[PDB]
Design an enzyme around this catalytic site. Structure first.
Site, mmCIF file in Angstrom:
data_model
loop_
_atom_site.group_PDB
_atom_site.id
_atom_site.type_symbol
_atom_site.label_atom_id
_atom_site.label_comp_id
_atom_site.label_asym_id
_atom_site.label_seq_id
_atom_site.Cartn_x
_atom_site.Cartn_y
_atom_site.Cartn_z
ATOM 1 N N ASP A 131 0.820 -1.224 0.000
ATOM 2 C CA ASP A 131 0.000 0.000 0.000
ATOM 3 C C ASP A 131 0.853 1.273 0.000
ATOM 4 O O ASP A 131 0.523 2.263 0.651
ATOM 5 C CB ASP A 131 -0.943 -0.040 1.227
ATOM 6 C CG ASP A 131 -2.184 0.816 1.064
ATOM 7 O OD1 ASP A 131 -2.525 1.202 -0.078
ATOM 8 O OD2 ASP A 131 -2.904 1.123 2.057
ATOM 9 N N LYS A 133 2.153 4.662 -1.127
ATOM 10 C CA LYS A 133 1.551 5.820 -1.795
ATOM 11 C C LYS A 133 1.851 7.036 -0.925
ATOM 12 O O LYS A 133 2.137 6.883 0.268
ATOM 13 C CB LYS A 133 0.043 5.626 -2.010
ATOM 14 C CG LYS A 133 -0.770 5.427 -0.734
ATOM 15 C CD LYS A 133 -2.265 5.279 -1.024
ATOM 16 C CE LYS A 133 -3.018 4.958 0.265
ATOM 17 N NZ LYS A 133 -4.488 4.879 0.035
ATOM 18 N N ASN A 136 0.899 7.486 2.670
ATOM 19 C CA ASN A 136 1.501 6.570 3.655
ATOM 20 C C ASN A 136 3.000 6.825 3.888
ATOM 21 O O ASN A 136 3.692 6.011 4.513
ATOM 22 C CB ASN A 136 1.239 5.098 3.279
ATOM 23 C CG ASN A 136 -0.204 4.693 3.496
ATOM 24 O OD1 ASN A 136 -0.919 5.308 4.285
ATOM 25 N ND2 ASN A 136 -0.641 3.651 2.804
ATOM 26 N N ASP A 151 0.876 2.690 7.949
ATOM 27 C CA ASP A 151 -0.237 1.876 7.471
ATOM 28 C C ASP A 151 0.131 0.516 6.877
ATOM 29 O O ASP A 151 0.184 0.352 5.654
ATOM 30 C CB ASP A 151 -1.111 2.660 6.486
ATOM 31 C CG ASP A 151 -2.513 2.070 6.368
ATOM 32 O OD1 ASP A 151 -2.692 0.885 6.726
ATOM 33 O OD2 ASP A 151 -3.494 2.717 5.944
ATOM 34 N N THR A 170 -4.867 1.318 -3.742
ATOM 35 C CA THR A 170 -5.397 2.480 -4.453
ATOM 36 C C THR A 170 -5.032 2.437 -5.934
ATOM 37 O O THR A 170 -3.848 2.415 -6.246
ATOM 38 C CB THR A 170 -4.775 3.732 -3.803
ATOM 39 O OG1 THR A 170 -5.283 3.853 -2.474
ATOM 40 C CG2 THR A 170 -5.210 5.026 -4.500
HETATM 41 N N1 86Q Z 1 -4.461 4.772 7.919
HETATM 42 C C1 86Q Z 1 -3.583 5.374 8.758
HETATM 43 C C2 86Q Z 1 -3.455 6.764 8.768
HETATM 44 C C3 86Q Z 1 -2.548 7.365 9.641
HETATM 45 C C4 86Q Z 1 -1.780 6.576 10.493
HETATM 46 N N2 86Q Z 1 -1.915 5.231 10.450
HETATM 47 N N3 86Q Z 1 -2.829 4.625 9.580
HETATM 48 C C5 86Q Z 1 -0.806 7.202 11.437
HETATM 49 C C6 86Q Z 1 -0.041 6.405 12.289
HETATM 50 C C7 86Q Z 1 0.862 6.984 13.175
HETATM 51 C C8 86Q Z 1 1.011 8.375 13.209
HETATM 52 C C9 86Q Z 1 0.248 9.172 12.359
HETATM 53 C C10 86Q Z 1 -0.657 8.588 11.477
HETATM 54 C C11 86Q Z 1 -1.450 9.506 10.583
HETATM 55 C C12 86Q Z 1 -2.446 8.872 9.613
#
Ligand code: 86Q
Length: 269
Positions: A131, A133, A136, A151, A170
């Site tokens: 994933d 992109k 991420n 992610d 995506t």
């Molecule tokens: N789908 C997502 C989206 C996010 C995150 N993890 N998964 C994230 C994890 C640690 C710190 C900050 C984030 C921001 C967005």
């Protein structure tokens, strides 16, 4: 595997929202015992086995298992896991600098090299992210910048060279083997890196069409070009790097090790 069943609220206080997924929301948090700050990702559990809503326990456990294995400066770390009836709650490293693209070739390669180092670590462990992109690729702290790949919801251990199970991210960023529902390996990540690189350098997306089906058709066909208007100033070596990643046949695509030795780098419905 069972997770911590105490109320997360007894141990952490939450703050500003940081981002989300389809069945997940991520919030800034502070551990009461230490004052250290983290990101708490609340993943919605499936309520029944036939439900299409929520994330299956199998999928949640795979992401947790992968996150526990990795320790590298360019990949997000997992601190703890809690759960209740509705959610699994991952307590993750606080990555507070937002997405990379929100934040020259030298600038592009500086960030690209950290992405490559993180993916080199992953692929060394036979972990495909699946994933990759711009959304991420996060900056730890945009005020200092170090990137963190986030992610791992689609990530898999590839112990037989490939996985065959309709994994699909995506449309803009997925490799032709994903579009065509073929066996998938580490090579799919390398395609996505070529896509990210193209956008990094040009601000344009190589395969993006007006609808999802057009994007997917474009990906499968390898329907892209280095638009002179967007790439007039870009070096031939940068384009050479991208061209060797955006290759239909996974076997002919540059590997992560290849990408590190390349002359530019080397010092769905
Ligand atoms: N789908 C997502 C989206 C996010 C995150 N993890 N998964 C994230 C994890 C640690 C710190 C900050 C984030 C921001 C967005």
């Amino acid at each position: 595997t069972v997770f911590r069943q105490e109320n997360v609220d007894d141990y952490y206080d939450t703050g500003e929202e940081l981002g989300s997924g389809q069945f997940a929301v991520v919030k800034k948090c502070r551990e009461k015992s230490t004052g250290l700050q983290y990101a708490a990702k609340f993943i919605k559990k499936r309520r029944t086995k036939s439900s299409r809503r929520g994330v299956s326990r199998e999928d949640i456990e795979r992401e947790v298992s992968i996150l526990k294995e990795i320790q590298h400066p360019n990949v997000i770390t997992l601190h703890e896991v809690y759960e209740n009836k509705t959610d699994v709650i991952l307590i993750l490293e606080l990555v507070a600098g937002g997405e990379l693209f929100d934040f020259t070739e030298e600038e592009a390669t500086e960030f690209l090299k950290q992405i490559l180092n993180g993916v080199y670590y992953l692929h060394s462990l036979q972990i495909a992210h699946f994933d990759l992109k711009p959304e991420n690729i996060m900056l730890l702290d945009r005020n200092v910048p170090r990137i963190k790949i986030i992610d791992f919801g689609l990530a898999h251990k590839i112990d037989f060279g490939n996985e065959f199970k309709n994994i699909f991210g995506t449309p803009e960023f997925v490799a032709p083997e994903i579009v065509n529902y073929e066996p998938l390996g580490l090579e799919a990540d390398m395609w996505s890196i070529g896509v990210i690189t193209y956008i990094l350098l040009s601000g344009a997306s190589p395969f993006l069409g007006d609808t999802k089906q057009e994007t997917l058709a474009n990906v499968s066909a390898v329907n892209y070009e280095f638009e002179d208007e967007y790439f007039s100033n870009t070096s031939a070596l940068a384009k050479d790097f991208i061209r060797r990643l955006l290759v239909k046949d996974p076997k002919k695509r540059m590997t992560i090790q290849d990408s590190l030795q390349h002359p530019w780098i080397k010092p769905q419905f």
